[PDB]
Design a binder for these strands. Structure first.
Lengths: 394, 394, 394, 394
RNA sequence: UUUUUU
RNA sequence: UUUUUU
RNA sequence: UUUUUU
RNA sequence: UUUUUU
RNA sequence: UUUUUU
RNA sequence: UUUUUU
């Protein structure tokens, strides 16, 4: 009767937020891994330049352990800040890892431990020398930068160090946009971002890393989750306005503008196209369940919080519920109308197992052959029937 | 049902202002660069004239470091004020740089440090002499001014110094309008502004810098963000009325009238043409999402504050969300009707990847062949059907 | 009549807080002096030990400039903190001086500048070498510590460094109690404090500086006001409870317990003895004005704020109004009863020009020969007349 | 007039809580020392017995570093708990030190590191062997226990291990009562406590450590503040009732009953004797200031919190204000009446510099020759005048 | 600063 | 201005 | 700490 | 930017 | 990202 | 799970 079909809606709403309530216990505590991070102790430009060169070499090194690579990545990311240790310690929310901040102090060819020399330090020094030697020998004499003069470059001016560091941060931060979604199909959007930032003169093109180093760093970023979590935390903190933003922070926020809502193109495309742009072909007895699921998904997305856009980057378990597969019909309709309407829509790889070609064809027809689609008109267009006819005439 | 398609609007509104709340921490502090600024200590016209000649030479100098160029630019901009040091210190909001104000004191061919002569001063003196020599030799004997007599000119009268300084400030401030949007396509609007100010007799044409110096200064301004931030802060402070405005301040505000809303022509054109000038072809099921996005953008623009018009100049990350690409359909419609209606509209370079030629054609037709477009008439024009027919007859 | 003698009280109350209202302008800005502070960049014990040895040598050095001595003192005081630069920058309220924090980085015999070596650094290195040589030659081969082995001691363990640093901070902080009140008559209370802290095992007596170095440091502390202001700010910050206190902080607070209310023994003795311990000889027509002045002084002291106890250390101008001389009669009475009652009271040098021997004799008599002094008894001692007689019998 | 002498009370009350308000900053952060703690990983009795034997040897060792001694003490104290690591981590509030909990795992003659054997482990093994050898050689073949058979004793039963561990904890916890007050004058009250616990059969006398080991451990406890802080935290946590108490916890609480209010005998004796036991000789114009100070001290003690009784153990700076010296007159009176009344009172060493023999004699007379001291009688003893006379007749 | 008993 | 004890 | 009666 | 009348 | 006029 | 544009 009347009561049923509403009890169903309440049941689905309750099932969506079924057990996602309360607070968990500390028993489910992940084992922690020690990660050694080399941060610059002082503000001298030469020390910071040598440190970032060392971090580039370590990241490029093939014999480097994963923990050393994560340490080098953390050193690189926090290089712009005047207090990298404070930035790392105050913007770390990774239960998987524990970070031991190490102030570099002075600067040799590698790093001088300067803590009980001879006792448990010489082995670390030889290890760092081996890492550097393997990094330099692995490449065919090619420096990490696309320009050989950028590697063996002496930096003593603060402005030059700042420019080079900003360029390195920009080139690193380009990769996060398509690091886990489709790392193989990258180097096109990344090149577009690099060209955009070069044309804006925000980055000096002299310090441009080669594509081999970029591929290695992207592979490291995709393999590791702690680096992604740290960078997402940095993005969230920068997104919060209120204070003055520096050049590095502004570049990071501009990149995060592209980073947001990555890996969830299906859901947002479904929203924008199938749900909005109201077409008379919506209520047809095969889209009502999908509409209810979509509404529940919007409520869940609002409930998640500030980490919702970067759900794929943090690899949230909630992301699976957002993926198409629970609403294949409306999703297929929406991507059909998207591919017919948006030219850019159509390069997306959507050869899934629930394509529903009938509904894709229905959406394709609904986009063009359906009708002009005159929605409720606040202004009284009494004589616009001929206008609608002319618009549909194309 | 009824509830859906409104939950969507609330979801998009919440997603727009998703994480832009709260206050950030001091951990994300950009590394600061020392910038040396030479300000005139006294009000003697000869000292100020020599100082601005030195600043012109330093800016024109090719061997000058970037920090020295920024110092010379800051010296030039604050030259009009009777207390340049106070103006710089009370109108600086650049976290990227720290300014060390240096009172010039006396005036030699370069600048006399007059602080422990011999100790850490002789090297600076030789450096300044090298800068001046390189600046003079780099040009083919051409002075920065278009008139050779304007360079080696003795100034002892306050009025002549004021006139020359005002001319230099005007010619510098013309460049900010098209410094980052399209610096290459400049020298047309800049020449138009210069002709306008010459015809108004606000600037004395004798102190007219050559186009080579203007190109060098524009390149420096585009490369550097601190100078842009300082000049935008000056524009914002001058825009606030209430006090008496001097000739320099009035010229600066008149230039800022053109400076405002630069680099965002797409968004404002979309507003003015597609949104306003209500055409019966608006509600057609492919513009509703764009309308919602545009409304959210207006709310965001109102929320930003007084820095909203100069978003491109400060290179805000929020500017990316305002750029066309998130609403290509309504944007294309609006630029179509603009190019058909506004003659000046059409010189804009809009060969983007989301042009949507079908909607551009639809807007072109909507501008002329659609209808006369009679909106709600407060006055009862019962007999104006023939008037509308005659108006449409063209 | 009745109205008069109350208008007088209101007049004196208004005269006390006559012009101490409103906010001052920035025109009265003291000229600032640059002070170079060498802080340890890292946490390595050897670097910190070498740095504090260098600071001890600089303080002991006779050829050192005053600014260098203040820098060495600031380096010494903030040595215990893990972030000396942050502690100095967040606890500095000295308009007289500006502090340029310098991270030491590495550690040579002196300090390596490690910033454009050769350019404006070699002269500083030779200056530091001259400072060290003069410091070592000035003494008759005597190390700053009372033990010659404590100077040329290698420190690699964190615990030993912490113990030595705590001892040095304690021995430095003993001097502030009697640095400006009576520096010449010191070395008795200072020795008592040192013995107290040795018996408590809070300080290791091996790192005990000689008395010559202590005298030099006390002279430097008395000469300089910025060091006193910084140490008073540290005392005020430590006094505020709420957080966990370390060994250094606990020692500093324990010393500040003695530091408080220094240099104002006359006023507080007058309060405690003349005002409290109510004697029938108070209201005698020569103490009413002094009572009114004392009440006004209490109101002023409450109004001053948290800096009231350390008024002599900061050399407040308000301290002059608190000194005896505006109420010599009641002050003389109070010191008379104090010298008769308190055995320790009597070592105070009070041979002032307003001693009023008649009132001193009156107080001496009031202490003993006056009466037993039975105040209002809450418990009804109906039979205690004989008890009072026996008590007065002595 | 009437207003004065109350403004004085308000002034003293405000001066007592002068600057003890607000929250301190993190700039005043003490440097932290790494402390290595060896905790038993499993519950096997043999492993725990070997671990506590090793800790006893390390504490007795003269060549052991202070950090190793603190680690051994922490291992000993938390030995009773089934999860020593959790107990240490959840009951540590020492900003001076950082604790790195180390699970022992297996058990060799010393401790097997069992973490990358050969790499940075062999040196630690040789160090532990040297520590054990020096500990065994330093003594004249004397085991830490008073019985030679208790050292080389095999423990495989859980009950025997529990009994031995409880005995060791008891003998360690006896020392805290007089570790910092008068460690030299100990071994009398400690022997009395040991005899009390032996007569109660709570501790098995077979595991009785020799007096040399007890003296060494007491010296270590007096030297170190972190161990005292940890043990005081344990005492505070145990004092909070509500849960079931084990034998070790009950013994610890019984010992803490004696531990409480240590090192503050002067203040509490002054309270109990001078303030309570109301004598007609109180209000005599030389005790009113002391009464006000005592009231302020009671308010401060109530305001301090649960850490108030163990103020001397934590070496609070607030303890100095509680010590006699700010109220020598009432203190002398109270100790006089105490020495006349309480037989145990009189062994206290009170040969201070502010004894005031006149007031001590006055208190001695007030105790006996003053009067019977009949206070307000709720029951109407109309005929008890002869009873009071007989009571005074003695 | 502290030196009792409990 | 200041010269004790704590 | 405790040493009665009940 | 401005180019009338008043 | 941006390329008009004002 | 993901593969557009921005």
């Amino acid at each position: 009767m009347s009561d049923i079909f509403d009890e169903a809606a309440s049941f689905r709403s309750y099932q969506s937020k079924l057990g996602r309530d309360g607070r968990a216990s500390a028993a489910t505590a992940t084992l922690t891994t020690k990660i050694r991070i080399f941060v610059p102790a002082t503000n001298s430009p030469e020390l910071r330049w040598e440190l970032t060169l060392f971090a580039l070499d370590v990241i490029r090194s093939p014999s480097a352990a994963e923990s050393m690579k994560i340490g080098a990545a953390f050193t690189l990311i926090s290089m712009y800040s005047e207090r990298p240790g404070a930035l790392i310690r105050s913007l770390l929310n990774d239960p998987d890892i524990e970070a031991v901040i190490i102030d570099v102090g002075s600067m040799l060819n590698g790093i001088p431990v300067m803590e009980r020399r001879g006792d448990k330090a010489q082995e670390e020094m030889e290890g760092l020398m081996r890492i550097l030697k393997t990094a330099r020998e692995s490449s065919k004499g090619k420096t990490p930068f696309v320009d050989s003069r950028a590697y063996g470059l002496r930096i003593t001016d603060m402005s030059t160090l700042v420019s080079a560091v900003i360029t390195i941060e920009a080139q690193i931060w380009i990769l996060i946009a398509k690091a886990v979604t489709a790392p193989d199909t990258a180097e096109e959007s990344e090149t577009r971002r690099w060209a955009k930032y070069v044309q804006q003169k925000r980055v000096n093109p002299f310090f441009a890393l080669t594509q081999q180093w970029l591929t290695e760093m992207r592979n490291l970023l995709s393999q590791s989750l702690s680096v992604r979590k740290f960078m997402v935390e940095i993005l969230m903190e920068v997104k919060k306005g209120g204070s003055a933003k520096g050049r590095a922070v502004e570049i990071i926020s501009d990149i995060g503008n592209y980073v947001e809502e990555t890996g969830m193109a299906g859901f947002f495309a479904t929203i924008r196209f199938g749900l909005e742009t109201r077409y008379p072909a919506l209520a047809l007895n095969e889209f009502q369940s999908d509409l209810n699921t979509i509404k529940g998904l919007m409520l869940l997305y609002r409930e998640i919080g500030p980490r919702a856009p970067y759900m794929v980057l943090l690899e949230e378990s909630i992301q699976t519920k957002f993926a198409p597969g629970g609403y294949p019909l409306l999703w297929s309709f929406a991507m059909g109308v998207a591919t017919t309407i948006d030219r850019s829509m159509g390069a997306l790889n959507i050869n899934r197992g629930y394509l529903e070609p009938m509904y894709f064809r229905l959406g394709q027809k609904s986009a063009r052959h359906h009708a002009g689609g005159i929605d409720q008109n606040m202004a009284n267009k009494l004589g616009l029937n001929s206008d609608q006819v002319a618009e549909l005439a194309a």
